[PDB]
Ligand binder design. Structure first.
Ligand SMILES: [Mg+2]
Ligand SMILES: [Mg+2]
Ligand SMILES: [Mg+2]
Ligand SMILES: [Mg+2]
Ligand SMILES: [Mg+2]
Ligand SMILES: [Mg+2]
Ligand SMILES: [Mg+2]
Ligand SMILES: [Mg+2]
Ligand SMILES: [Mg+2]
Ligand SMILES: [Mg+2]
Ligand SMILES: [Mg+2]
Ligand SMILES: [Mg+2]
Ligand SMILES: [Mg+2]
Ligand SMILES: [Mg+2]
Ligand SMILES: [Mg+2]
Ligand SMILES: [Mg+2]
Ligand SMILES: [Mg+2]
Ligand SMILES: [Mg+2]
Ligand SMILES: [Mg+2]
Ligand SMILES: [Mg+2]
Ligand SMILES: [Mg+2]
Ligand SMILES: [Mg+2]
Ligand SMILES: [Mg+2]
Ligand SMILES: [Mg+2]
Ligand SMILES: [Mg+2]
Ligand SMILES: [Mg+2]
Ligand SMILES: [Mg+2]
Ligand SMILES: [Mg+2]
Ligand SMILES: [Mg+2]
Ligand SMILES: [Mg+2]
Ligand SMILES: [Mg+2]
Ligand SMILES: [Mg+2]
Ligand SMILES: [Mg+2]
Ligand SMILES: [Mg+2]
Ligand SMILES: [Mg+2]
Ligand SMILES: [Mg+2]
Ligand SMILES: [Mg+2]
Ligand SMILES: [Mg+2]
Ligand SMILES: [Mg+2]
Ligand SMILES: [Mg+2]
Ligand SMILES: [Mg+2]
Lengths: 105, 159, 187, 147
RNA sequence: CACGGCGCGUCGCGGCGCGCGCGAGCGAGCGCACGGGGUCGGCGGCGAUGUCGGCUACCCACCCGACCCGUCUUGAAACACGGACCAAGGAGUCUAACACGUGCGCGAGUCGGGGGCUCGCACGAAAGCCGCCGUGGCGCAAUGAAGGUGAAGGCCGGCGUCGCCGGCCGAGGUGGGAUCCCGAGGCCUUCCAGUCCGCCGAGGGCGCACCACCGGCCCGUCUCGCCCGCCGCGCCGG
RNA sequence: UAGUAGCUGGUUCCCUCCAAAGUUUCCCUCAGGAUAGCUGGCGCUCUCGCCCGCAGUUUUAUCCGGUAAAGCGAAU
RNA sequence: AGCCGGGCGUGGAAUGCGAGUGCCUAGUGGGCCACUUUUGGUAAGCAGAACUGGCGCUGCGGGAUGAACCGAACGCCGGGU
RNA sequence: CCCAUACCCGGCCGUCGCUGGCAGUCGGCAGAGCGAGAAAGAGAGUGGCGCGGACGCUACGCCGCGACGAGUAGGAGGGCCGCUGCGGUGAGCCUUGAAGCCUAGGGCGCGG
RNA sequence: AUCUAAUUAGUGACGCGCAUGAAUGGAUGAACGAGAUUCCCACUGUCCCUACCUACUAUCCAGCGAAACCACAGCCAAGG
RNA sequence: CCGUGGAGCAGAAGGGCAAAAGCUCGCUUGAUCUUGAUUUUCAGUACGAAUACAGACCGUGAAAGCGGGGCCUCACGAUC
RNA sequence: ACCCACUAAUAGGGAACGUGAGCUGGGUUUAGACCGUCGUGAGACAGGUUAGUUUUACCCUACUGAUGAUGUGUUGUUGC
């Protein structure tokens, strides 16, 4: 029942929410495991960059962010061809390549 | 329970006095009310336009707005445990200047005048209205006639 | 038996700060002594305001301080505020002021020192002027908090411009029945 | 902490601060927001007017990004650039005016609220308001639109 | 008789009142007490195996008082209900949301909660750091259903019967307002000239926060009416 | 599934201070709620050691009324 | 009618008393009794109202006994009335 | 003439108020006051032997005056009241005897 | 009307039937009924009006041994 | 000729009304468009009803004026 | 309530409308049935009819009886 004055609230606890609860007590262990895997892969690929393949310059696709510049999924075939890089050799020498991206500009 | 009609129980309050029905005298219409006069409320049943509610009958308020035919007045109403100063619009028939304020105004003028006077004279004069003081000592002169006896009369039935 | 009422027998005002830090309590000791052994009431006011809570010591802005000290007659006097002096960015010219406050924002302090004024703390204020002559006692806007927009005469009631408690602002949240003559009634 | 709570002080009082006449029962008035129009109507009307009913048009696939348009005011307009910029423009004698780009700092529309210091400015933005435009013109300066 | 010096005594009404000087407003001791709450600088007995002290607590006697608790109830000792007795257990907790009050840090900003860097690892699953990891949240702008719009102005010189450019000044006004400023006068002693410093104080200022009221500005809507702009002079825009 | 219960029963230490209501309005409302009222807590703005206000009171003025009483040689 | 400026304090009845203001808020929403006024009822320790005070929430002296009557309201004690 | 927890006088506890007082413990480097009906300086200046003196002040402390003290439902404050575990600390205690339990013993606190 | 000294009972008639009635069956009826009623004969302790006798208990003892229930408990009159 | 209302004013009752609020004629559609304020029940919330205004278009009258329904007190309805 | 008979008279009442751990259970008042009236129906009837489990005392007191206690030194007899 409403008290004197306050906000109308709609708590979404009308289901059996107590059976599906995600506690985060394994967060530090997860961070430690991810780190260990990261360093293990970095050691595995001996001289190669730890981050991975280089990626391209892209513009965010929205009025809210079109002023910013991201890191894209991969270089497209038009760019590879005009840069003189074969689409199959780029991946094995360290260039991320995707064929979906176009080039309007 | 009772009825919530606007004129319930007003058959004597809004009625006209004995042998005073008919045309409203024009002096009531020919009075001037300005902003801020203290004024009395007395509902008159002869005219039904702008009749005040029965709970303001006999109440005294202050004029705050003057209009073609009516006057807006601020009057206090006791509602349960609190008093609200609420403003109502009453047509000019049901209204009448309060004489409770003019006495104080005349007193103000008069004691201001007697304060301005005697200021050069340097004498002392009383302005505050003191309460009725106890009677002072005096002499009661008998003129040679002695006071007459008073005795209770004997009981004897009338009816 | 005595015909009296004990409802309002006990007054509620603060006797000492609710805070537990030691610097404010030392200031309170000093100004307690000053107030009880000096006839000046400036010390009493300052000590009372030291007792007060955070929401009763609203911050004072640089623009407010310069505006209130630019008034005629109060030149080269020390502006005393028991709250926090925060910087105002929408003011370019800042004169030289002699400020005293419990704490001052870093940017505000930089601005005043660059302009050429000096910052005082209530201790040194005691040394400079124990009775506090040549002081302009200011305070921030106490009604500045947004909680005061929800107070007073209740909403949904004629001639009440009181902010309701709504979880989100939009066209679907408290706009239909009591707010329109088209749907029910308009207060 | 449980040490400081009201329950500790309430031990020994049978009632537990809930009354003897009217007990502490489960849900005397109904659960949640029940009876908003029937037996809590007075409270709902007194404290949340406009709660019931519909108004306005429905927009199905709303995308906030289309309507994203942050605003800035003229009193804050000079804070976008460094102070050294403003003072250099102030004591400059060639009449050159600094360029302030609010889109670079993340603002799209310039609204004219505050007083503007008397020095020329080249304000470039995406949207302007009439009063902001007239303030800039009066102080001496230029308004530039970008897309 | 709570009268007591000498003067100059009009400081005066006829002397009394009542003023001006008299090393300049300094006589000292002892003592008694109906005097800002009790002292005695007064005494007397009984003390080693039968006596001294021990409020309370152990038992007993007497006088007065005294109905069994808890609970619902207008009303409980009730011919209302629960209760043979004892031990242990036994009931406003935790999460989320919101509101308000309080304490702390920073402050027009604030916050790493997610991730990452730190030789992973007793504590340590902690702690530190990131700053071109503040994405992002809340706040800094509101209003309108929406298209959308989006938060002062006040004075002089240039054509009052100014079109209209400059010179400026700058974010109102009234009332009440804690504090502060000023300050007519006023705060002592041989006199007299004459200061310094500090306190007092008529009136008068500047007026915080806050309240009330009057204006002003922004958005929607209504009424009235005229003017202005052009890349496209229009069912245009202001 | 520890189903719901506006309905019974119970609801665990001490001292100190303050201290009620069974009334208004709405509800398929009448063994219950919401809302005013009554309570407490937290404060804050000033005040005195010329003056401000306030009052379950009186006084002086000034209005308001149709009960007790009375009347039917006055209206009904 | 609103604005400005100026002049008037013997603070213009008695009595008493510091006042104003803002948040958050529990319990309550079964009542009962008495003088007086009063409706229904033959009447009732009945049913229903108005004012005030009580009981409920309250012990104490008295009415032998007693929720309400008369007196008087309460920290632990000594004396007096 | 008798007596209530009423009234008067006195003692003690507590609460509230005075938003009362005290940093002045200013000592042979000193001079012991700010109770006294009257808003404010024991004001500063310039000319005509014996080496001595109690307590205090955990200022969250100490001290002084007045008034007051019923209480269910309920609200608030203080507990050097109590139980269990954790971080500190007591150069803590303890087989020359800890915890627990029993007691016609001695005491403290209004009470826990 | 009969039954009895006496009959709210029973049986036989009367029918204006609160509200009888025809396979929601009406009327009758031999035989039958641990079915429901009234009267008569016989018989009797049902009664007038109680008494006596027998067996097993109850009673006391040896052995063995619970349960219900229990605020505290247990003499009355009146008052409130 | 007398006639203070002893009639009538739609309805219950009460109040009010005489060159009128009654009766008879003439002309009309203020029963129209629009923003606010206030009163009545009241929590001082809605609905309903009502009161003074203000801004346009009108009606009527020679005009002053009066009129945004019925002389007043009742004749009515949220969200979706 | 009425009647028959006797009698001296066949007066009226209370005690939780005395008295169910005293009886009985004929009546009311469960569940089975039947009829009449009512209801579309399940069903209803202060209408009629028929059949329908009546539990426990060993506690306290009261009461009826039975030992005994109490003082006179112990006992006994006779007594008031
Ligand atoms: Mg509640
Ligand atoms: Mg007392
Ligand atoms: Mg209080
Ligand atoms: Mg309690
Ligand atoms: Mg409740
Ligand atoms: Mg609850
Ligand atoms: Mg006795
Ligand atoms: Mg009970
Ligand atoms: Mg009660
Ligand atoms: Mg019983
Ligand atoms: Mg019960
Ligand atoms: Mg029992
Ligand atoms: Mg236990
Ligand atoms: Mg709340
Ligand atoms: Mg449960
Ligand atoms: Mg119920
Ligand atoms: Mg109940
Ligand atoms: Mg009457
Ligand atoms: Mg009469
Ligand atoms: Mg109840
Ligand atoms: Mg009654
Ligand atoms: Mg009371
Ligand atoms: Mg009492
Ligand atoms: Mg008696
Ligand atoms: Mg005594
Ligand atoms: Mg005393
Ligand atoms: Mg008490
Ligand atoms: Mg023992
Ligand atoms: Mg027979
Ligand atoms: Mg027959
Ligand atoms: Mg038939
Ligand atoms: Mg047939
Ligand atoms: Mg049949
Ligand atoms: Mg045996
Ligand atoms: Mg006419
Ligand atoms: Mg008009
Ligand atoms: Mg008409
Ligand atoms: Mg019996
Ligand atoms: Mg039977
Ligand atoms: Mg049956
Ligand atoms: Mg036996």
């Amino acid at each position: 029942a409403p008290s004197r004055n306050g906000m109308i609230l709609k708590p979404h606890f009308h289901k059996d929410w107590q059976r599906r609860v995600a506690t985060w007590f394994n967060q530090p262990a997860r961070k430690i495991r991810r780190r260990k895997a990261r360093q293990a892969r970095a050691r595995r690929i001996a001289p190669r960059p730890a981050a991975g393949p280089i990626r391209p310059i892209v513009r965010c696709p929205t009025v809210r962010y079109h002023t910013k510049v991201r890191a894209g999924r991969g270089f497209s075939l038009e760019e590879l061809r005009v840069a003189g890089i074969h689409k199959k050799v780029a991946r094995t020498i360290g260039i991320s390549v995707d064929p979906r991206r176009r080039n309007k500009s | 329970t009772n009825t919530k009609g606007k004129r319930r129980g007003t058959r004597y309050m809004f009625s006209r006095p004995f042998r005073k029905h008919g045309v409203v005298p024009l002096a009531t219409y020919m009075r001037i009310y300005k902003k801020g006069d203290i004024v009395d409320i007395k509902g008159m049943g002869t005219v039904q336009k702008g009749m005040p509610h029965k709970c303001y009958h006999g109440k005294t308020g202050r004029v705050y707005n003057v209009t073609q035919h009516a006057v807006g007045i601020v009057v206090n109403k006791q509602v349960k445990g609190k008093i609200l100063a609420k403003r109502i619009n009453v047509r000019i028939e049901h209204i009448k200047h309060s004489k409770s304020r003019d006495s104080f105004l005349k007193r103000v003028k008069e004691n201001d005048q007697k304060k301005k006077e005697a200021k050069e004279k340097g004498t002392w004069v009383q302005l505050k209205r003191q309460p009725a003081p106890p009677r002072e000592a005096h002499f009661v002169r008998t003129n040679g006639k002695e006071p007459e006896l008073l005795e209770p009369i004997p009981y004897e039935f009338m009816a | 038996g005595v015909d009296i009422r004990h409802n309002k027998d006990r007054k509620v005002r603060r006797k000492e700060p609710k805070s537990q830090d030691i610097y404010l309590r030392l200031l309170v000791k000093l100004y307690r002594f000053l107030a009880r052994r000096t006839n000046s009431t400036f010390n009493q006011v300052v000590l009372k305001r030291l007792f007060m809570s955070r929401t009763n010591r609203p911050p004072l802005s640089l623009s407010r301080m310069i505006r209130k000290m630019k008034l005629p007659g109060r030149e080269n006097k020390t502006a005393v505020v028991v709250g926090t002096v925060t910087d105002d960015v929408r003011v370019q010219e800042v004169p030289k002021l002699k400020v005293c406050a419990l704490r001052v924002t870093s940017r505000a302090r930089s601005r005043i020192l660059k302009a050429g004024g000096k910052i005082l703390t209530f201790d040194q204020l005691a040394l400079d002027s124990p009775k506090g002559r040549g002081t302009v006692l200011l305070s921030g806007p106490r009604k500045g908090r947004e909680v005061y927009r929800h107070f007073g005469k209740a909403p949904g009631t004629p001639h009440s411009h009181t902010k309701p408690y709504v979880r989100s602002k939009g066209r679907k949240f408290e706009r239909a029945r009591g707010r329109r003559a088209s749907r029910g009634y308009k207060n | 902490p449980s040490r400081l709570r009201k329950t500790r002080k309430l031990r020994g009082h049978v009632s537990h601060g809930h009354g003897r006449i009217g007990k502490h029962r489960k849900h005397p008035g109904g659960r949640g927001n029940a009876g908003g129009m029937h037996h809590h109507r007075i409270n709902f009307d007194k404290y949340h007017p406009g709660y019931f009913g519909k108004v306005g048009m429905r927009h199905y696939h709303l995308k906030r990004n289309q309507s994203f348009c942050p605003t800035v005011n003229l009193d804050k307009l000079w804070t976008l650039v460094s102070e050294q910029t403003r003072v250099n423009a102030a004591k400059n004698k060639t009449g050159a005016a600094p360029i302030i780009d609010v889109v670079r700092s993340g603002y799209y529309k310039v609204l004219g609220k505050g007083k503007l210091p008397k020095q020329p400015v080249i304000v470039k933005a995406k949207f302007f308001s009439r009063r902001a435009e007239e303030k800039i013109k009066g102080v001496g300066g230029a308004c530039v639109l970008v897309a």
